[PDB]
């Protein structure tokens, strides 16, 4: 379960790749209802179809 290379072992295109923590653990407390709601509303607004 170890990645011999560095951060390049992660997949940037994964579904939850934006939520993988590396050293920004202060952002965990920012994952409340309002912020997640705004993020996903932005995505749905940007939806192309």
């Amino acid at each position: 379960m170890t990645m011999p290379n560095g951060s390049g072992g992660l997949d940037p295109g994964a579904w939850l790749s934006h939520w993988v923590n590396q050293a920004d653990l202060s952002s965990l407390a920012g994952r409340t209802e309002d912020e997640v709601r705004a993020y996903f509303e932005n995505l749905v607004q940007a939806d192309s179809g």
Binding site: M1, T2, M3, P4, L10, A14, Q22
Partner: protein, 586 residues
């Protein structure tokens, strides 16, 4: 630094007298080593404070001569059970028996067994006790669980920094970084959460300048010590994912792949011991547990380590070389090995084994101080591994609803359902759930080359977290290839050998061993130490002095059937919990 000329002058020019002086010094050093090896253990029982405050409170001490029998194993990254049998007239046995019905006492008891003046310590919580009758003679058999069982009851929620029954986003928690830092950080975040999430988490918990100095950590029962994200020297990274999984289950695969060791130490400040290197390390209370991830094997290091050797030229240094995609790692021998010796090897009174320079080779021949129980080797099994299932990046339910209904509405407004002329844009996504890039197959070229024409083909591997391979493809493949590999395990019993377990060699540290069997006399099997049990029996019938049994290396093949069934059952239960929590409601 007494030179030969100085010693000869002190002996008045008599070479025989000078050499007798040197021999006496060597004899006194050997006698000190033997006394350290044969020293009795110190067994002490501690309890929680009856008023409910912090700090373990000293209950008492069990004499080694007053024991009936005892058995304490130290295992690599695995919980172990310690067993202590006492006579029921013993005062600590009486105290333990009165404990369940004593309303003035807390019900948790901690045992600490100290070897070599506290240098080696086995500490653990009480699991149970049993009053057993051997021919109308009653004795108390007391079972403790070692302090690595706390990681089974520590679990990582999707958002450890937020209230659990309110909103736990995202679905799983994923942390990526240097291996030691990430494991220690996961443990620390869960410790913070379970202690109360009272304060705000900084970016890096182990950047000690981020934590305020006014903060009080004395109420914490467990601590984790590690270097910062930037200062961590772990060569390889790791990705750890969890959806309410236990911490030990989360970190087992990473620890195995990086050959890392979890070391626990219960800091008895009543003995004068102190701790440093973690937040609040100065105000910790008596009997507080501290965890540390260490690299005792040094297999992933830049300079490599010793993976093999022969009794006629010692160990051989090899370094890991990673193939395409870093899934496969082979060993390349350092032809001109010029690694400097550790500075600790030049210090008086040092006995430990440094990770960078293993030294302990245990030889078996006609005149051997040990007994070798069994040495088993088995080749690798499966050339290729398949890991996968569904790929959420392609057919997540949110996509399947929103994007597909938008595409269908666009097609409808263009008039596709009125007449087939219109060209659609992905209106069939719900029909292809689990089919687009849903798998990862890797064939281990090195394993195939080592195995040959006749071999087992492939194996499907399900990870500890069911939906994390898409997040870390490489980590999933390496964890899958952790299973069916070449396995060597050797059992030793050190009866009166000069080897001092814990002092000369520790858990997770590489050592070589030989077996007096024709064809492999010269070969040295180099494995990282995995188990060592200290056991004794004071019974009149059979009386066994305190003896150590080592198990170097690990093998699923030579593991007993009961142990295999238990390990499989544990993994199956964890996977069942993960699948059940990943179930989508109807």
């Amino acid at each position: 630094a007494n030179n030969w000329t100085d010693i000869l002058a002190a002996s008045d020019g008599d070479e025989w007298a000078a050499f007798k002086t040197i021999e006496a010094q060597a004899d006194e050093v050997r006698a000190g080593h033997q006394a350290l090896r044969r020293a009795k253990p110190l067994i002490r029982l501690w309890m929680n404070n009856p008023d409910g405050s912090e700090g373990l409170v000293y209950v008492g001490r069990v004499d080694y001569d007053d024991t009936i029998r005892g058995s304490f194993p130290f295992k690599n990254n695995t919980p172990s059970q310690g067993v202590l049998e006492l006579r029921d007239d013993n005062y600590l046995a009486v105290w333990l028996k009165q404990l369940p019905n004593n309303p003035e006492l807390k019900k948790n008891v901690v045992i600490t067994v100290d070897f070599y003046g506290g240098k080696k310590r086995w500490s653990g919580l009480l699991d149970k006790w049993t009053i057993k009758s051997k021919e109308h003679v009653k004795y108390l058999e007391v079972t403790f669980n070692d302090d690595l069982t706390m990681l089974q009851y520590l679990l990582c929620p999707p958002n450890p920094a937020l209230p659990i029954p309110v909103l736990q986003f995202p679905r799983i928690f994923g942390i990526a970084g240097p291996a030691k830092w990430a494991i220690s950080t996961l443990i620390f975040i869960n410790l913070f959460r379970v202690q109360g999430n009272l304060w705000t988490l900084p970016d890096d918990p182990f950047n000690l300048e981020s934590w305020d100095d006014i903060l009080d950590w004395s109420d914490w029962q467990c601590f984790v010590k590690s270097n910062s994200f930037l200062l961590d020297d772990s060569s390889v990274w790791t990705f750890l994912s969890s959806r309410m999984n236990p911490v030990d289950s989360i970190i087992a695969d990473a620890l195995d792949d990086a050959q890392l060791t979890i070391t626990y130490r219960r800091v008895l400040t009543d003995d004068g011991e102190t701790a440093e290197g973690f937040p609040g390390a100065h105000g910790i209370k008596n009997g507080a547990l501290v965890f540390e991830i260490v690299d005792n094997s040094n297999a992933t290091a830049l300079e490599g380590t010793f993976f093999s050797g022969t009794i006629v030229d010692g160990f051989a240094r090899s370094v890991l070389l990673y193939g395409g995609g870093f899934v496969e790692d082979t060993l390349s021998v350092v032809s001109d090995d010029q690694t400097l010796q550790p500075d600790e090897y030049y210090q008086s009174g040092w006995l430990a084994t440094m990770a960078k320079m293993p030294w302990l080779v245990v030889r078996d021949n006609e005149w051997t101080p040990i007994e070798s129980s069994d040495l088993s080797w088995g080749p690798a099994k499966n050339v290729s591994v398949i890991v996968g299932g569904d790929n959420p990046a392609a057919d997540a339910i949110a996509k399947l609803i929103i994007e597909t209904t938008g595409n269908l509405l666009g097609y409808f407004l263009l008039g596709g359902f009125s007449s087939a002329g219109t060209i659609a844009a992905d209106i069939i996504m719900p029909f292809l759930v689990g089919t687009i890039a849903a798998w990862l197959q890797w064939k281990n070229t090195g394993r195939a080359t080592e195995l040959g024409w006749v071999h087992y083909w492939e194996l499907y591997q399900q990870g500890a977290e069911t939906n994390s391979w898409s997040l870390a493809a490489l980590a999933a493949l390496r964890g899958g290839f952790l299973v069916g590999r070449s396995e060597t395990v050797h059992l030793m019993a050190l009866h009166d050998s000069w080897i001092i377990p814990g002092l000369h060699i520790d858990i997770g540290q590489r050592m070589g061993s030989t077996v007096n069997s024709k064809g492999v006399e010269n070969i040295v099997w180099v494995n990282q130490l995995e188990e060592m049990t200290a056991a004794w029996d004071n019974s009149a019938g059979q009386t066994m002095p305190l003896s150590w049994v080592l198990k170097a290396g690990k093998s699923d093949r030579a593991m007993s059937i009961g142990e295999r069934v238990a390990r499989l059952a544990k993994k199956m239960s964890e996977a069942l919990n993960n699948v059940g929590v990943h179930i989508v409601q109807s």
